[PDB]
């Protein structure tokens, strides 16, 4: 975005810089280990309240 002004004139050179830098990492683990003991011909249970 450049402009020109024919009515004024700046003194010297100015640079006015600005820097920004960012880095990031993440790591989520979630583990489950379930046992159930049961029988061969096991049926469901109907309680359900």
């Amino acid at each position: 975005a450049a402009t020109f002004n024919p009515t004024q004139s700046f003194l010297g050179f100015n640079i006015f810089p600005t820097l920004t830098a960012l880095e990031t990492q993440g790591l989520t683990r979630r583990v489950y280990d379930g046992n159930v003991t049961m029988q061969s011909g096991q049926r469901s249970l109907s309680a359900t309240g």
Partner: peptide
């Protein structure tokens, strides 16, 4: 008629009950 079939879920047993000809048909299936 047709042969009687009895299925047991606990033991996974199939029981066929009928005339000897109707029972040999299920036995080959």
């Amino acid at each position: 008629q047709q042969a009687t079939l009895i299925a047991d879920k606990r033991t996974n047993s199939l029981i066929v009950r009928g005339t000897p000809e109707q029972v040999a048909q299920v036995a080959e299936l």
